[PDB]
């Protein structure tokens, strides 16, 4: 009603989820997703991620596993319940349970 | 520090006993709260793990649906990337009251708009419709999981702070009150025995003067 | 000495005197005159007056027992609501707390300077307690009735719809015996009871 | 006077005496007889008894020290397994807890209304404790080796493979030396030990 | 007899003497010679010596007032920070706590048998307190002013920037005025003050 999920991932995953029914041009004329190709810089990825975090109206962010691991320090630097971020599997990188920030909160409880 | 600074007296004992009783009741209330929150923490963690292991295989199914569609139709990534204007899925705020606090969760909703109903009209779109259905189901499940994880973090923080207060009370207040009460008891006994000595002495002196006659 | 029971004279007097009217230093500090403790004081003459009541009034004893129960429940729940942040207030808890607080702040205190509070007749007290306990009981009945079937009633709608009734109930304290006669005050209380019934029937 | 261990008399008696058998009511409420605490009780005469024990048994002292260590470690670990949920831990720790439980249910208990369990010979007790602790020692060594070598054996595997052996350990207490000969009991216990050794060897 | 201040001899002494140096066994456990308490001790000759001290130094009253305020603030905050966990603290509160434990470690502690510390004259005490008060004023001003504009100066940041100067503040005591001349000490402390100002202005 007032919150729109966001997706960051390779061309395949962003295409899939933008089919899945997300992404919207807001009043400032921006999407709610980033395309990360082979020709992308980690710095640009963090810049867009911080912009999304500052955008309160997103609520949920979806990132695939290896990108979440590629930027692991800055993703863990933010702790807060409201702006949820979820790691999801991908094609050549199936999801790894042993690497997940939310599960690090439940350390040793296995 | 060592004992609450109060001059010992008969009323002081009952006052400090009442304080100890109140502290014990507060301890009990915080302990039950911690237990209930911890049980819910267990349940939500197990549910998250289950939902995630299912989310993996459904995402694999959706990925293979994409692969099927890429053959039957070819490639349409630019066509769907560069025409985003409005969203078809929406999220509303919600909360659930558990253990006296609110757990924030999210309501998944179908927005009645549409932006990709006509794409691939002639080349072929059956695989596209299958991909559509698969990603709709995946989005539903992911919203469910994200709500669970947000509530999970909130509940963990709540457990942390209730146990914080429990340990503070248990490891500070009780021994202080006990030490104060013991000091009060010792001082009362001291005063009593001094009074006894003084009465005993006056009685002995009275006997001494009486024996003269 | 020191506001305590350590005094052997005090113990001897308590062992003999029938009715003890102990005072409470904390409410004396709060200046809720009179400073009656209501938890340690006692009167072993209630049973003696049963015959006189059953002969002349026949309604005071139920109201009095209910008043004492509601006060005791509020006193016991005081610490429970204190140690939980006053957030887990069940519906019955809110009903009890509001009603007992109103009774303790309006129906259990008087100022001797004003002419309308230097003497409360027994019928005046009977009417006051009757009206207030009727308000409490009918509100509780409404809440519990709606809870089981549908649309559980909270105290917000009750305040909204019986705001006038509450101010009338609190202003029952200022119906001067000097100005208004016995018939006038009793008719006033009866009319306020009728108005409360009208408002509650409207919401029901 | 009400369980307060602060009397001058009780403190002085504690100072003079050498052995202390703490008694509880909680265990009698828990349906466990005889009632010993196993933590506040103590003995100081062991140094003198070393000569007699070395002269007759030559295993009671190491076995008792091991039992005390295991019981205290289980009491220490009761809290960690409470915060984990008693459903996940290291296999060595799990087996330690399991033998502590075993010692509790078949060694540290005796029924006074059962005719044959009103008297346990000291040699019978020594044999029982030695059998149990040898069983634990072999299990612990097997798990520790297989943890790093190959096919880490879990307590589920051990218990399922050896469920008859736990049954025999539980039933070891039903010997009744009053009617049953001493040599017969020793032969039975030694045969059980050999069976356990062969079962462990077949496991690894 | 036992450190309790309710005994008759101390009670009589209090009403007669005019300077009271109460001691504390806890600091003596910490080996903090002298184990003054500096919360119950008092002197009734504060105003008696104002004219003398203003005839000679005149830079002492702000130091005394600020020091007493700083110690009182730390003592008031000790219990609340103990209860919470020493996490939820404003920058000013953190600065006060930091300078407080510094002034405790630097000025209160003292040993009358270390060669440089056998004696410490009043000019040197005034100089040291002045240096510490300058530290406190400058640091509090810096963090306060930068708290509202941009790039808020954190305790960790200033500690990292001038941890060495904090060690210089720690080692001021190593002078031995018997050997080294007064003018040398005054020049060194003035140079230290200038270095401190430069270090602050580096991040200002």
Which positions ≥6 away from E11 have C-beta within 8 Å? E5
Residue C22, phi-psi category: left (phi > 0), alpha (psi -120 to 50), beta (remainder) = beta
Q: How far apart are CA D110 and CA D108, in angstroms?
A: 7
Q: How far apart are CA E91 and CA E99, in angstroms?
A: 12
Q: What are phi and psi of E9, to 5 degrees?
A: -65, -45
Q: How far apart are CA B55 and CA B58, in angstroms?
A: 5
Task: For residue B183, count CB atoms less than 10 angstroms from its CB and return exposed for 0-12, middle for 13-18, buried for 19 or more.
Answer: middle
From C40's Cα to the closest Cα of chain B, the distance in A is 14
Residues of C in contact with B29 (CB under 8 A): 83-84
Nearest CA in chain A to B105: A82
Other beta carbons within 10 Å of D26: 9
Token couple for D169: 């350990």
- Collapsing DSSP to helix, strand or coil, A85 comes out as strand
Cβ contact, residue pair B164, E83, below 8 Å: no
Which positions ≥6 away from A7 have C-beta within 8 Å? A13, A14, A17, A18, A22, A23, A32, A33, A61, A62
Token couple for C113: 């300077």
How far from the centroid of its chain's Cα atoms is residue B204's Cα? 70
Give the largest CA-CA distance in chain C: 60
Cβ contact, residue pair B84, A86, below 8 Å: no
Cβ contact, residue pair A1, B89, below 8 Å: no
Chain C positions touching chain B (beta carbons under 8 Å):
2-6, 79, 83-84, 87-88
If we measure between CA atoms, which residue out of A25, A26, A74, A66 comes closest to residue A49? A74
Chain D meets chain C (3+ C-beta pairs below 8 A): no
Q: Which helix (H) or strand (E) holds C20?
A: strand C19-20
Angle ∠(E69,B3,B182) on CA atoms, nearest 5? 170
Q: How far apart are CA A73 and CA A86, in angstroms?
A: 16
Q: How far apart are CA B112 and CA B84, in angstroms?
A: 16
How far from the centroid of its chain's Cα atoms is residue B202's Cα? 67
Residues of D in contact with A106 (CB under 8 A): none
Question: Any CB–CB contact under 8 A between D6 and chain A?
Answer: no
- Collapsing DSSP to helix, strand or coil, C42 comes out as strand
Q: What are phi and psi of A60, to 5 degrees?
A: -130, 140
Residues of D in contact with A110 (CB under 8 A): 88
Token couple for D173: 């207490």
Cβ contact, residue pair B25, C5, below 8 Å: no
Which positions ≥6 away from E197 have C-beta within 8 Å? E138
Cβ contact, residue pair C6, B100, below 8 Å: no
Q: Which helix (H) or strand (E) holds C94?
A: helix C91-102
Q: What are phi and psi of A93, to 5 degrees?
A: -115, 85
From C11's Cα to the closest Cα of chain B, the distance in A is 13
Across the interface, of B9, B22, B100, the residue whose CB is closest to C87 is B100
Q: How far apart are CA E72 and CA E96, in angstroms?
A: 10
Q: How far apart are CA E68 and CA D130, in angstroms?
A: 70
Across the interface, of B10, B11, B26, the residue whose CB is closest to C83 is B26
**Chain A: partners with 3+ C-beta pairs within 8 Å:** B, D
Q: How far apart are CA C169 and CA C159, in angstroms?
A: 13
Residues of E in contact with B164 (CB under 8 A): 85
List, as one string, the DSSP characters of D82-117: HHHTSS---HHHHHHHHHHHHHHHHTS---SSSGGG
Cβ contact, residue pair A102, B153, below 8 Å: yes
Nearest CA in chain A to D85: A109
- Collapsing DSSP to helix, strand or coil, D20 comes out as strand
Q: Which helix (H) or strand (E) holds A73?
A: helix A73-76
How far from the centroid of its chain's Cα atoms is residue C170's Cα? 11
Question: Any CB–CB contact under 8 A between B29 and chain C?
Answer: yes
Q: What are phi and psi of D38, to 5 degrees?
A: 70, 0
Task: For residue E49, count CB atoms less than 10 angstroms from its CB and return exposed for 0-12, middle for 13-18, buried for 19 or more.
Answer: exposed
Q: How far apart are CA E83 and CA E97, in angstroms?
A: 15
Q: How far apart are CA C81 and CA C89, in angstroms?
A: 8
Residues paired with B92 in a beta bridge: B107
DSSP assigned state of A22: -
Cβ contact, residue pair B93, A86, below 8 Å: no
**Chain E: partners with 3+ C-beta pairs within 8 Å:** B
Residue whose structure tokens are 């919150």: A3
From C41's Cα to the closest Cα of chain B, the distance in A is 18
- Collapsing DSSP to helix, strand or coil, D157 comes out as helix
Angle ∠(A60,A61,A64) on CA atoms, nearest 5? 145
Angle ∠(B201,B202,B205) on CA atoms, nearest 5? 85
List, as one string, the DSSP characters of chain E: --S-TTSHHHHHHHTT-SEE--B-HHHHHTT-SS-B-SSS-EES-TGGGHHHHHHHT--SHHHHHHHHHHHHHHHHHHHHHHHHTS-S--HHHHHHHHHHHHHIIIII---TTSGGGS---HHHHHHHHHHHHHHHHHHHHHHHHHHHHSSPPPHHHHHHHTHHHHHHHHGGGTTTTTTS-HHHHHHHHHHHHHHHHHHHHHH-
Cβ contact, residue pair B142, A3, below 8 Å: no
Q: Strands of chain A (E only): list them.
A: 6-9, 33-35, 60-64, 84-88
Cβ contact, residue pair C6, B26, below 8 Å: no
Q: Which residues between 14 and 43 in chain A have a beta carbon less than 8 angstroms from any beta carbon of chain B? A: 14-25, 31-33, 35
Residues of B in contact with E85 (CB under 8 A): 164
Q: How far apart are CA A21 and CA E167, in angstroms?
A: 62
Across the interface, of B84, B146, B154, the residue whose CB is closest to A86 is B146
Count of pairs with CB atoms under 8 A, one residue in B, one in C: 19
Cβ contact, residue pair C4, B9, below 8 Å: yes
Q: How far apart are CA C172 and CA C164, in angstroms?
A: 12
Chain A meets chain E (3+ C-beta pairs below 8 A): no
Question: Any CB–CB contact under 8 A between D28 and chain A?
Answer: no
Q: How far apart are CA C166 and CA C154, in angstroms?
A: 16
The structural domains of chain A, ordered by start, are 1-110 (3.40.50.10580)
Residues A102 and A80 sit within 8 Å (Cβ to Cβ) = no
If we measure between CA atoms, which residue out of E124, E122, E136 comes closest to residue E65? E136
From B108's Cα to the closest Cα of chain E, the distance in A is 37
Q: What are phi and psi of C7, to 5 degrees?
A: -90, 120
Q: How far apart are CA B141 and CA A73, in angstroms?
A: 28
Count of pairs with CB atoms under 8 A, one residue in B, one in E: 3
Residue C123: CA atoms inside 13 Å, Cβ hemisphere, count? 12
Residues of E in contact with B172 (CB under 8 A): 83
From C48's Cα to the closest Cα of chain B, the distance in A is 34
List, as one string, the DSSP characters of chain B: --S------HHHHHHHHHHHHHHHHHHHHHHHHHHHHHHHHHHHHHHHHHHHHHHHHHHHHHHHHHHHHHHHT---HHHHHTT--S-SEEEEEEEEEETTEEEEEEEEEE-S--S-SSTTTTT--HHHHHHHHHHHHHHHHHHHHHHHHHHHHHHHHHHHHHHHHHHHHHHHHHHHHHHHHHHHHHHHHHHHHHHHHHHHHHHHHHHHHHHT-
Question: Any CB–CB contact under 8 A between B18 and chain E?
Answer: no
Residues B14 and B180 sit within 8 Å (Cβ to Cβ) = no
Tell me the structure's resolution in angstroms, rounded to a single decimal.
4.5
Question: Any CB–CB contact under 8 A between D88 and chain A?
Answer: yes
Token couple for A46: 């963090």
Token couple for A20: 């899945």
DSSP assigned state of C26: H
Q: How far apart are CA D136 and CA D123, in angstroms?
A: 20
Residues paired with A33 in a beta bridge: A7
Q: Which of E1, E8, E83, E86 to mutate to test the interface with B (most CBs of B within 10 A)?
A: E83
Residues A36 and A9 sit within 8 Å (Cβ to Cβ) = yes
Residues of E in contact with B6 (CB under 8 A): none
Chain B meets chain C (3+ C-beta pairs below 8 A): yes
Count of pairs with CB atoms under 8 A, one residue in A, one in B: 119
């Amino acid at each position: 009603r007032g919150k729109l999920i966001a997706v960051i991932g390779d061309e395949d995953t962003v295409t899939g989820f933008l089919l899945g029914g997300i992404g919207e041009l807001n009043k400032n004329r921006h999407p709610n997703f980033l395309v990360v190709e082979k020709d992308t810089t980690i710095n640009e990825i963090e810049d867009t991620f911080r912009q999304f975090l500052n955008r309160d109206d997103i609520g949920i962010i979806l990132i695939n596993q290896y990108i979440a691991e590629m930027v692991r320090h800055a993703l863990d630097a933010h702790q807060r319940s409201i702006p949820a971020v979820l790691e999801i599997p991908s094609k050549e990188h199936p999801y790894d349970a042993a690497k997940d920030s939310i599960l690090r909160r439940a350390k040793g409880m296995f | 520090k060592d004992r609450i600074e109060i001059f010992p007296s008969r009323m002081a004992q009952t006052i400090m006993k009442a304080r100890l009783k109140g502290a014990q009741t507060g301890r009990n209330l915080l302990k039950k709260k911690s237990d209930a929150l911890t049980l819910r923490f267990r349940q939500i963690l197990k549910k998250i793990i289950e939902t995630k292991m299912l989310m993996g295989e459904v995402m694999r199914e959706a990925a293979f649906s994409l692969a099927e569609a890429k053959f039957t139709a070819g490639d349409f990534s630019t066509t769907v990337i560069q025409n985003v204007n409005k969203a078809q899925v929406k999220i509303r705020a919600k909360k659930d009251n558990v253990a006296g606090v609110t757990l924030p969760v999210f309501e998944h909703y179908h927005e009645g708009t549409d932006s990709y109903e006509l794409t691939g009209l002639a080349r072929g779109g059956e695989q596209l419709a299958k991909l559509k259905r698969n990603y709709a189901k995946a989005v539903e499940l992911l919203v469910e999981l994200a709500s669970l994880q947000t509530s999970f973090v909130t509940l963990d923080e709540a457990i942390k702070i209730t146990n914080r207060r429990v340990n503070a009370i248990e490891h500070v207040i009780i021994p202080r009150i006990e030490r104060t009460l013991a000091y009060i008891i010792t001082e009362l006994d001291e005063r009593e025995r001094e009074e006894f000595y003084r009465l005993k002495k006056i009685q002995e002196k009275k006997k001494i003067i009486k024996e003269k006659f | 000495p020191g506001g305590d029971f350590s005094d052997p004279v005090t113990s001897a007097t308590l062992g003999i005197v029938q009715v003890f009217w102990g005072l409470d230093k904390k409410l004396a500090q709060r200046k809720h005159f009179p400073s009656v403790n209501w938890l340690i004081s006692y009167s072993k003459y209630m049973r003696a007056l049963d015959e006189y009541y059953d002969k002349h009034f026949t309604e005071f004893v139920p109201l009095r027992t209910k008043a004492k129960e509601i006060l005791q429940e509020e006193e016991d729940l005081a610490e429970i609501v204190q140690l939980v942040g006053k957030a887990s207030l069940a519906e019955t808890d809110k009903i009890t707390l509001e009603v007992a607080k109103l009774i303790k702040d309006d129906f259990l205190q008087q100022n001797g300077y004003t002419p309308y509070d230097r003497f409360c007749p027994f019928y005046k007290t009977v009417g006051m307690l009757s009206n207030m306990i009727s308000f409490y009981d009918m509100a509780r009945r409404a809440v519990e009735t709606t809870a089981q079937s549908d649309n559980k009633i909270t105290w917000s709608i009750i305040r909204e719809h019986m705001g006038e009734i509450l101010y009338k109930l609190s202003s029952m304290k200022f119906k001067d015996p000097v100005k208004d006669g016995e018939a006038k005050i009793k008719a006033d209380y009866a009319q306020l009871l009728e108005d409360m019934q009208n408002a509650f029937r409207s919401l029901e």
